[model samples]
Target chain A: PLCTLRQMLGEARKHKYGVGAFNVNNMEQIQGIMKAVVQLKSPVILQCSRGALKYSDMIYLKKLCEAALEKHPDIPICIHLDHGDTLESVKMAIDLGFSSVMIDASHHPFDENVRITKEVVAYAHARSVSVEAELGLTEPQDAKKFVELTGVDALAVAIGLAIDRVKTISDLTGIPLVMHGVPKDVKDMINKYGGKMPDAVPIESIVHAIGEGVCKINVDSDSRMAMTGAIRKVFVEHPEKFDPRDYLGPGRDAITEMLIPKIKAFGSAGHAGDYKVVSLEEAKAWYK
Target chain B: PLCTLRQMLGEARKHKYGVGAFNVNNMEQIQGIMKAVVQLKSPVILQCSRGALKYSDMIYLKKLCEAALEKHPDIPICIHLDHGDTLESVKMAIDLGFSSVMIDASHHPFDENVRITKEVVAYAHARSVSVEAELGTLVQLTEPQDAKKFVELTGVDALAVAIGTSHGAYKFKSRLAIDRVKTISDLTGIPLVMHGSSSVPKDVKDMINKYGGKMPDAVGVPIESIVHAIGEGVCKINVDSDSRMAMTGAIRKVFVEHPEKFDPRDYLGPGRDAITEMLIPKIKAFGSAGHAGDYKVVSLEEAKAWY
Candidate 1:
């Protein structure tokens, strides 16, 4: 059974590593991520960006996720709305049956952000769903203020933060932390599979965060780079092949191959088996 | 609503037109073929090759076909099994709720072919479904040589005679003998079916190879041969390559012409509309346009009574 991101973020915090929230845009992305996680026995968060939801409508996009869930029933999966900017958006996310949602009201005024986040918390919590409230890359002072006000379970911080600073921020906010870090080697691996420089900026400042802080890591750019690089190489090589699968298949496969090390580095490779399976209510059961 | 291919083909026989059975693998074809039939009012058979069923498993493609039917219910549709060489494969197609099957014992020995066809017919007919059995076209033409006996022995509802046409574009060099096709219809009165009947539309394949595709040696059965055969006795004609080739050429052209554009809809939309437009010539060639209203819908009572 699938659970909320809260359970995943919670387990990662307890174990002191991070769970990568891989963003999906279409069938290939979903297939690639699920394929990687299933093989490694890794639990994963499959979130959709607003641009993705707009690109591949809510219905067809949901089919990809739903089919991926049906494909890997044993692997614990969480569906989330990435950077949901308004109460209206989070409301739509909940209605679409997202396991959890993140409301990014940080761009608004502080009072406005607090108001929207509080509304999302009240609405989502009553239904046994987890809420992620974003306060941007706030200082330890405002991080404390935001968490104290909104009751967010996880906090997004500056990506690639030093481990000491991660511990410092967690100490100040006392909230589960998230950082979007990718190792540059992901590009090196891309060149290995691709046989050409992807001109990549890879990230995986993840292992240091393990057993330290930063329980949730965002990994979207690396996946995007992997997909584009694979497709480009395949297209450039086989100028004769016009079939979408000739390129799309390689793109999907490359994403799976590229994301494996990242998953392992998060210490989440075998951690999916560690967490006890939870029902929807069990996952959201009275979390602080 | 969808009906058995047997019921729909009977209308084609009486009306002296041909119903086109198009091979489908995924959403692009389903949306393409159904979009054409919806506009043209032609009764269509949506069958899947062993390659196609392997490409996009039976469940997934069938769901895509069902979605097509939901979008276009006025035209009668039959989900047929194409070139199923064995029982286990046919069984999987049947399990996926296929309305008809082609038990291609054409490659097997005569006695063994009869045995498997009899068994397959027995299995299919018991479920109120239909069966199509093929006899070799050019190299192994079934033309009147035991054609009637095969029909009576196996009790197959339709017989796909190989009078020279084969699957895809490269089979264009073969001979087309409608007289052999005529002899089977005259002797047996069972509907004659033609597979690989796509008239490799030169215009379609020309643009495909011209715009970044490598289908260099491509030609199809001439429309004259197709039209002649349909007017004579070919009631069910299977079209796979042309409709898909047309779609491929369309999207391939879109991507090549506009390398900066990556939206699937931009490419797929043109490909889909190309299919809708491409199948019109073939549907007209098969002589089934405006024939959607020719048959009364089969009811549950009639289905069970037949079963």
Candidate 2:
């Protein structure tokens, strides 16, 4: 039952839903997301950014994740390295036995990207590690061109398709999963193209959007915006309060609400029991 | 038997020597210092300062120390609050079960200092906790002014006598070890204290400077000066900057010498070991070793009940 990021996303593809990858910066965020995951029975991806690597320290964060896993052995959790731009950073994560890694070498040319991706694939595949790479630029015109240069394991393509391009990139790269950072209105495009939009997307206006091929939905900026907005509202409402708990409590709760719905939308609810049968050894074996 | 800070200082007074209080930041520092204390069989004071409290949340740090004590019950380790300037900070430390605390109101007026110290003593005494207070002004920029107000603040368990002592290496133009000891010893009846004590071994300083360290004039109140102070009845000495300098200097040396090094464990291991080796001799010189086991034998029940 132990599954790699690929296996979990594979399951999501079959279930017609997506899995949620949440960014964890500290203990509170970890606890908040884990609590939601347990309630939803959903598989979750816990990711750490480059800046987070420096702030929390790699060993400390790894230990924290290990402790969480020990405490909730039933919950299927994947520790991922997000947006690792350098080989040194990627190697550090790989050596530490991270479950998955994302090498954002989309800044390079297509041939260069393919060369670097091939090199990484060779090294990571030897260790039974799963790799994720970007294909299209997220922003800026020249940056988009760079993704065409360096291809990766799981190619993230910016084809103006948003949700629609998930199938196209998957077919092109022979990769099982694709991350489509599209707006809510494009949910139907994903369904029409035989892809999936996670329930976390507010797609009320666009009906009949099936979450088939979409496996992981990254929800960081949305959570941050919601939490900060709540805290700012509190400050405006109660100018006399100096205690941190007064503001942080509501902010944390706001994030929790935003996350619980995402967990439900991703169909990861009540998935803790699923992890009971999956062993870490088996998960690593599957990745290989 | 379970010993209060007062009892520990009393033993030091009877022996005519001083006890060394080292500040701990993390697990490595705690384990390294405690290991040295076990080897030397000396009583050691593990203190936390305001900056430490801010860096690591107070509750978490307290829990960490408590767990460390549970694991190595033989060490006579008194968890003390160092340089607590606010009532909230002191109250929080006490509430978290700190056995000893320093009520540093030396920055206040003479009467105000006495008033606050007395209040803390009354509160701490009722709970069987020992209180420390600063009498004169420490040379650190963060310390408040009270240059001539020594020996007047009664009910203080130990007196942090700030003569010419400051915090960190850059405190002195040259070695003023003898003057530092004589002035503090002459002024206070309570166990005199000195802050900002580190040897800043010339070899280590030069090595760090050679390796891109911008500190050329970096200096510390030499450990030799602290040894002199202990001989002169300065019972409790506060050491922070020295341990930090030692750890940083050692790690920087490793990085400069081995450019290929990336593993943090390989580097921090030597840094932690260096501090342990550096402080054991100092603890032995202070003459408080082998006293930890005696303190550990006391039951927690008795410790909790002891005043």
Candidate 3:
């Protein structure tokens, strides 16, 4: 079943579990994520970046996501817009049936960000969709006031915030925290296979943040690197093979393998069936 | 929209052109093929082998095919099963809503093959779906008399005759049995199919070898041979390796030239474009280009009423 970010986040906040928000650009990526999500019985957030939509047309992505939902009806899936920068972009995602959208106005000044986010919240809430807003380098006081003004369902704060600072921000804002800018496994795989990133610290630190109040953990790099690593390995070792499936199939499996531990570590595993799912219509009613 | 192979082939046989039957296992391949077909205004056959279905699973394949239809409703798309080996495989494709199915009973004895093909034709045509049946193993070219007999007995919508073309990138210097194709056409007088019909463009093979690939002396069917076959009543040409090579070459180029590029789209997008580019000339050469709306579209139910 489909769910909204608000619904998933609220549940996770109550249970102290974290949901993995995986990014996708195409069917293979979506299928890989859903395969892992269903296996672990975990609720998932499948986010699409604006660049991703541009890479593969919006129609293809929408159809692919609908197909994913069609294939796995029992699992709670949230199709989210990741790092949306404009009102039109957010609305496009909403009209495309995304259950959640992030309005990234952190680059704007505080007051301007509040105004832009508030407008999006109003529009999104009217349709029963959820909005995630980010604040650049948040002071706890400003974070609380921003949530008060904009009414965002989730708040993505500055990276490297102390764990206790996350608790402070969570306590003040009273919303699910989104940990963006994931830095770890993805880069390592890229580095190992061909391209490159850092390691270790963020792995344990992720779970620590989840324990505090980070309910939604964004993961794009991990799957990207995993898929690229797997693909590169196949290309290097099995140069004789020409079938796209020979390499991309393993690439898809690597994404599945990469996601399993993250879902478990985030404690969202086995919680898929634990809650009743809500459609956007039902969620709209909740907003009303 | 979704049209049966019988629908598309009936049109092609009438118009004396050929529709390309490209195989797919995933979304990118499907998208790549449709991109070319839609651009050329050509009707297409997206055939999935049993191996492809197992690789991606039936549900995913079904959805991807449906997505292609949804994305390009103007193009007549026939979702087909290629080289289905048994009654169960053919039935599975039918149940999965494939617009066409191929029952490859050519490996069986002639009598057994006829029995199997006849059963599939009956089941498929009962639902107004289309059936393609292989008459003889490629090891032995499909004899014109055998093709005539098979077509007569099974009432298959199309006959995939073995006229010397074999599968894969390494199709050595065996010329297309052009005279055999003409003989089969004159005997059967129905839409004929040529499998392993990819032209395996030297450009793509060259690109692959240049970009960290080790493919040696790979060859495919000639465009002239394919065009001649079309002129001689080959209404459906199946090409999988051409697209595979194009995509592989493009992706391999990306991996080597841009090692920093990890996004699948960075490479896959170019690979998809390569398929589109490679297929355009083939579609034009096969004479299906600009024929998307050449005939009236028929539904499966409408087609069934003809029987």
TM-score of each: 0.80, 0.54, 0.96
Q: Which sections of candidate 3 miss by over 4 Å?
A: A182-201
TM-score between candidate 1 chain A and the true chain A: 0.88
B140-217 per-residue lDDT for model 3 (tens digits): 778898889888888998899888888898888536578888888888878898988888898899999998777877
lDDT of 3 by residue, A1-288 (tens): 779999999999999999999999987798799889999999999999999987666777887788788878888899999999989999899888899999999999999999999999999998989999999846899999999999899999985746788999999999999999543555555666655434433568888998899999998877887888888887778887899888888899999988888889999988988889877887878767
Q: How many Å off is the CA of A68 in candidate 3?
A: 2.1
Model 2, A144-233: lDDT tens per residue?
333334333354555433544444444344444545332332333223322223455443211112242546666665554444445445
Q: What is the lDDT of residue B96 in candidate 2?
A: 72
Rank order (by lDDT, best first): 3, 1, 2
DockQ of 2: 0.03
Separate DockQ for every predicted complex: 0.18, 0.03, 0.57
Q: How many backbone clashes are present in model 3?
A: 0
- Descending-DockQ candidate ranking: 3, 1, 2
Better of 1 and 3 by lDDT: 3
C-alpha lDDT of all candidate models, in order: 0.75, 0.62, 0.87
Q: Which residue pairs in candidate 3 have backbone atoms (N, alpha carbon, C) closer than 3 angstroms, thus clashing?
A: none
